[PDB]
Design a protein around this ligand. Structure first.
Ligand SMILES: O=P(O)(O)O[C@H]1[C@@H](OP(=O)(O)O)[C@@H](OP(=O)(O)O)[C@@H](OP(=O)(O)O)[C@@H](OP(=O)(O)O)[C@H]1OP(=O)(O)O
Ligand SMILES: [Zn+2]
Lengths: 96, 48, 167, 561, 229, 48
RNA sequence: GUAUGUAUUUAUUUUAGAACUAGUUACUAACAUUUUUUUUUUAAAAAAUAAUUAUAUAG
């Protein structure tokens, strides 16, 4: 409502237990390597083999984790692997 | 605004393929990007 | 409980219905007005056949909060002075018109705007907000019960004009 | 082109024709006269004031295509709401806001709302039987509830004797519902008004949406979960409803809604203001006016009153410090009398009425109507009138809006010009008006003592002769009354106490003055006229009427045989 | 009709009066329309991991592995933007159940007032409607075709007047002083015609013979004519 | 606090960040109370 | 009708004339609502035709 002041976090919000986010339920063995950390805030913030530190600046994975993220992100991949697709849609045809 | 409206067209017909006409898209990443890039341009103007 | 009622009826035959105009401008005046209203109701009750009989019960029900306020000395003084002036010109023998005139002073009053008027035209000015009627209005617009008993005083006035016409 | 656009149906679903309530599109075609701007284009008129005249046709054009202009499928636009109504207009058109304000002026949205609320509540008072209702209590809600479109409270509460076996929510016309599912103690009724665009005008979806929002949400405070929601579309003349029924509600409510939707005065004032804002005629003149052939209708048993406004706003001209003069208002009177018994309620309007305001010749109309509504409210129901005759036609529209509050009182505009303005020029009346220091109601009896020896109808026609004389010559007649110093007036009394022989002679002097001055002024002798024509003259009746035509045809039929 | 132009009275070639315009619902627009209702219709409607033949591998709604009713197209702007579509009743049932549980958890006269009733043997925002009265179009809700005129707020009854059939005008019946004016008006006209000849051509004075021009003389003359008989 | 420093007390700024007058303004007051593009632009950003 | 401007003090600061008379001009004023087509003679003659309007204007 327009005449309602914004309710205080410390009274009306903070004491309520949160609700369920989106979280697509993963398989147990097809998605084995990425299951325990896919939906965290900073997913490997403290795992010094797969990250530099909590400054969170560089990353390095193995092959099965990277392959699992490759399969799992099918609806948003590019899926054009030859450069002759963009024959007259490259940037320089647009400039011409 | 026109950018966000155009983005809706290219998101919905990827979302609504084989599932109708209702609400419920919620893929809000590209529109969010558009309004953040508006905000960083109107920081120095509104400070002036 | 019937003892106080009996002693109050014995005091009720003691006090008299005389409105003196110098006495208008406090509890004894309210009791004298209370009793004159009761006597008007009794002169209806003596002759209930010739009138409308359908108005009498509703008149008593609409008058009963007014009679209660006059029995308890709780009526506001500006309103009570006007009512006593109506009831004085009613009590006098021939000036039945001055009763209705003081009644028009009772019901509407001397306010400039009796009922509020809002949004007269297309063109809005600030002074139009002075017009409206929440702030100062007629006594007939204070509350819906007050409308009933102020109307019922007029109804007793019409009764009294008929009674002084015939009997 | 009309076949190209699709026809009159697909043209008129864009227009505001549905909200007017003409019967047929064929009545869109008339010889329409412009009226105001025709009079105003010839006057001496400022440069800035003449270009303002050309935005009068544009407001009518913007009103007519207003569903299509103020539609809902917009590209960009921030919806705002008008002040005293509930219309959301997408963005800002300045012509359309003026048109819809002129339509909904004098707080008409809220009068429509509480009109339909009291009508529903009076039907539910009429049916405390077979619906088994214990009490129907009308709620006192916030005065902005009529147009708070965010949320709403209930305004009618139905408390029952024992229990109501209450169905599942469905629309007003769905014909199949089981009463066995639920049990409540009380029910609520609520009335919602929407103004429809070209797109958003599916009223059934609107009422189901308002019910399913306002019951489940926490802002809308209802007494029980069980109730019904009644919705009305003002732009498109539609109604529907949604909610919890029991045995006996639905056939009562659908009949209630169709008769309230056809015969509410408030919705008629809305549709009439729409027809005026579009400038289109519709002749709906069920009762004839108070003409000279109806003339004795004033002397029936039922109580009725003449109201007159001509002396309400008066001014005095005075020189300023500059060249131009200025007008200052003085005291006024609202002239209301009843002709059968001569009671004259004289409202003295002080100048503290006109204190800060301006325009002062528009506001006087609403002052008279508001004061007549106060006078009628102060009367009892058996003593309230059954009819009110308005003298000037500009007093129709304020009295109609203020007598929305009293639906049982008829209003007839008069057809014959009445001389009551000359009642200012009686010195006993003018004295009490001018000496007043306080806004007040003063009573007079304009038939002085006539009702003893003289019956009331000849007394009214005597008063007609006197006031026509004082409006015609004003000093010759005032000297005709004041010939002899022997006849005085009393303290209670208006007129000189003549004997009845003297009234016969002086009425003869009055008709001589009136008819000779008329025949001298308009170059038409009285002697060649019909008795109908002289009775037409003295009552101030106007020719070009249909009544004069049908009267002369009836007299021709009566005298040919 | 006279008013319609000739570009509307003309029918085009392929309609070979004004039958061509008639199909909102004009020509009974005086009758208000009602809610049409609520109708919510749902209709029915290769990939490596789904196994269905319809879509492409990028379009499969199942999760990628290592190895259906649809809103029927109604195009009212209220129907595509309706917040409550395909509503079964879950929210209202949860509301009623919560209220039923809460309801299941839930379950003088003064001395002087008695004195006055024993003698009598028994907020400026308040509206001006005067609740205890009743409007006139409410008494005939049940039948049809009400008698209330919304323009001039009269309620045509049988006692109050009668309708002329050809003019459709409601002229009231007269009562007492109206009868004593009408029969006296006819009396003044008859007395005038017998007193002079008043045949309305003879062009002489006749100002004393119109009633309203001098009513007191005609009242006393009517009165003495009553006294003589 | 900006609106009330400037002397404008008849403008109401409700909690959904709309600026509406509490009465019918005079013209002198409508001159004194035209807030700029900058105020209303900041105001719509806070609303968003 | 706006713009815009102007007016609204009480809480105590020490010691050549006299008389009579009525209308004509300008200007100003948000202050106020008795048909159509003819013909003919020198007032009279002919012919004709059809349930009722705006509170809206500003530099
Ligand atoms: O394209 P826009 O002008 O932004 O309007 C669209 C559009 O409606 P139209 O193209 O028919 O005007 C969509 O419709 P489709 O492309 O799907 O036919 C859609 O509606 P859906 O929800 O059915 O996709 C959508 O709705 P939303 O606002 O929920 O994105 C939205 O409508 P509006 O912009 O008018 O709200
Ligand atoms: Zn698939």
């Amino acid at each position: 409502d327009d005449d309602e002041p914004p309710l205080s976090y410390e009274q009306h919000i903070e004491n309520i237990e949160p609700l369920d986010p989106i979280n697509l339920p993963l398989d147990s063995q097809d998605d084995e390597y990425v299951k325990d950390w896919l939906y965290d805030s900073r997913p490997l913030e403290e795992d010094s083999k797969k990250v530099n530190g909590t400054s969170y600046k560089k990353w390095s994975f193995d092959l099965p984790e990277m392959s699992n993220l490759y399969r799992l992100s099918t609806p948003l991949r590019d899926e054009v692997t030859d450069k002759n697709y963009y024959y007259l849609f490259d940037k320089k045809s647009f400039f011409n | 605004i026109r950018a966000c409206k155009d983005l809706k067209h290219i998101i919905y017909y990827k979302f609504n393929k084989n599932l109708g006409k209702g609400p419920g898209c919620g893929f809000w990443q590209p529109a969010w990007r558009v309004w953040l890039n508006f905000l960083r341009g109107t920081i120095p103007l509104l400070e002036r | 409980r019937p003892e106080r009622i009996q002693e109050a009826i014995a005091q009720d035959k003691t006090i008299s219905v005389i409105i003196d105009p110098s006495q208008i401008g406090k509890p004894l005046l309210s009791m004298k007005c209370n009793l004159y209203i009761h006597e008007i109701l009794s002169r209806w009750k003596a002759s209930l056949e010739a009138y409308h009989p359908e108005l009498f019960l509703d008149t008593k029900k609409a008058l009963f909060p007014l009679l209660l306020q006059l029995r308890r000395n709780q009526l506001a003084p500006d309103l009570l002075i006007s009512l006593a002036t109506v009831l004085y010109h009613l009590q006098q023998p021939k000036e039945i018109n001055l009763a209705v005139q003081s009644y028009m002073k009772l019901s509407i009053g001397n306010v400039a705007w009796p009922i509020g008027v809002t949004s007269v035209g297309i063109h809005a000015r600030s002074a139009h907000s002075k017009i409206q009627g929440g702030r100062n209005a007629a006594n007939i617009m204070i509350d819906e019960r007050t409308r009933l008993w102020i109307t019922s005083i007029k109804r007793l006035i019409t009764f009294e004009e008929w009674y002084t016409s015939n009997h | 082109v009309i076949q190209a656009l699709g026809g009159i149906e697909t043209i008129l679903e864009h227009t505001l024709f549905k909200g007017t309530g003409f019967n047929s599109w064929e009545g869109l075609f008339w010889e329409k006269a412009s009226g105001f701007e025709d009079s105003m284009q010839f006057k001496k008129l400022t440069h800035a004031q003449r270009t303002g005249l050309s935005q009068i046709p544009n407001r009518r054009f913007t009103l007519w295509w207003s569903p299509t202009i103020n539609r809902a499928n917009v590209y960009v636009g921030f919806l705002v709401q008008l002040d005293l109504t509930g219309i959301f207009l997408h963005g800002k058109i300045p012509t359309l806001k003026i048109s819809l304000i002129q339509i909904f002026r004098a707080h008409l949205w809220q009068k429509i709302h509480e009109s339909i609320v009291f009508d529903i509540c009076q039907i539910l008072d009429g049916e405390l039987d077979v619906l088994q209702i214990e009490s129907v209590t009308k709620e006192t809600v916030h005065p902005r509830k009529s147009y708070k479109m965010n949320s709403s409270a209930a305004d009618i509460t139905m408390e029952s004797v024992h229990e109501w076996e209450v169905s599942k929510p469905s629309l007003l016309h769905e014909t199949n519902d089981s009463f066995k599912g639920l049990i409540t103690n009380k029910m609520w009724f609520d009335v919602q008004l929407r103004y429809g665009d070209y797109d958003s005008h599916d009223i059934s979806r609107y009422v189901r949406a308002k019910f399913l929002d306002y019951t489940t949400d926490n802002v809308s405070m209802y007494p029980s979960p069980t109730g019904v929601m009644i919705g009305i579309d003002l732009a498109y003349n539609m109604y529907d409803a949604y909610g919890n029924w029991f045995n006996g509600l639905k056939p009562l409510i659908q009949n209630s809604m169709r008769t309230i939707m056809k015969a509410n005065p408030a919705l008629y004032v809305l549709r009439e203001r729409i027809r005026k804002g579009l400038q289109i005629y519709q002749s709906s003149v069920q009762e004839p006016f108070l003409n000279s052939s109806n003339y004795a209708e004033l002397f029936n048993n039922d109580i009725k009153l003449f109201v007159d406004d001509t002396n309400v706003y008066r001014v005095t001209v005075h020189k300023t410090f500059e060249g131009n003069v200025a007008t200052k208002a003085i005291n006024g009177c609202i002239f209301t009398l009843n002709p059968k018994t001569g009671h004259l309620f004289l409202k003295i309007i002080h100048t503290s009425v006109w204190a800060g305001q301006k325009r002062l010749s528009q506001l006087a109309k609403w002052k008279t109507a508001e004061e007549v509504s106060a006078l009628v409210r102060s009367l009892p129901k058996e003593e309230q009138p059954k009819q009110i005759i308005v003298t000037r036609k500009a007093m129709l529209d304020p009295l109609e809006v203020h007598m929305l509050d009293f639906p049982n009182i008829a209003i007839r505009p008069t057809e014959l010009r009445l001389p009551f303005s000359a009642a200012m020029s009686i010195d006993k009346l003018s004295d009490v008006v001018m000496k007043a220091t306080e806004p007040q109601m003063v009573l007079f009896n304009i038939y002085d003592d006539w009702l003893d020896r003289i019956s009331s109808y000849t007394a009214f026609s005597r008063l007609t002769l006197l006031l026509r004389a004082l409006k015609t010559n004003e000093e010759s007649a005032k000297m005709i009354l004041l010939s002899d110093p022997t006849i005085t007036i009393k303290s209670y009394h208006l007129w000189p106490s003549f004997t009845d022989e003297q009234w016969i002679t002086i009425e003869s002097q009055m008709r001589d003055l009136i008819l000779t001055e008329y025949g001298r002024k308009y170059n038409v002798n009285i002697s060649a006229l019909t008795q109908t024509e002289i009775k037409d003259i003295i009552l101030g009746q106007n020719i070009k009427a249909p009544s004069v035509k049908r009267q002369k045809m009836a007299e021709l039929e009566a005298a040919r045989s | 009709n006279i008013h319609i132009p000739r570009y509307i009275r003309n029918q085009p070639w392929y309609y070979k009066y004004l039958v061509h315009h008639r199909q909102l619902d004009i020509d009974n627009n005086s009758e208000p329309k009602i809610g049409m209702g609520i109708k919510d219709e749902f209709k029915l409607i290769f990939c490596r991991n789904c196994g269905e033949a319809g879509h492409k591998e990028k379009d499969c709604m199942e999760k990628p592995r290592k190895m259906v009713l649809v809103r029927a197209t109604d195009d009212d702007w209220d129907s595509r933007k309706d917040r409550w579509y395909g509503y079964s009743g879950k929210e209202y049932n949860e509301l009623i159940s919560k209220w039923e549980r809460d309801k299941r958890n839930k379950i003088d006269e003064e001395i002087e007032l008695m004195k006055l009733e024993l003698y009598k043997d028994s907020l400026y925002r308040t509206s001006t409607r005067l609740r205890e009265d009743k409007a006139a179009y409410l008494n005939d809700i049940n039948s049809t075709e009400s008698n209330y005129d919304p323009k001039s707020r009269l309620y045509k009854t049988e006692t109050l007047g009668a309708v002329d059939e050809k003019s459709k005008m409601f002229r009231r019946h007269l009562t007492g002083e109206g009868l004593k004016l009408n029969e006296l008006n006819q009396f003044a006209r008859s007395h005038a015609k017998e007193m002079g000849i008043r045949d309305e051509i003879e062009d002489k004075e006749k100002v004393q013979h119109v009633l309203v021009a001098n009513p007191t003389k005609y009242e006393y003359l009517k009165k003495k004519r009553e006294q003589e008989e | 606090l900006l609106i009330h420093r400037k002397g404008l007390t008849y403008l109401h700024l409700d909690y959904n960040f709309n600026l509406k007058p509490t009465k019918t303004l005079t013209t002198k007051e409508r001159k004194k109370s035209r807030l700029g593009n900058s105020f209303h632009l900041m105001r719509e950003l806070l609303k968003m």
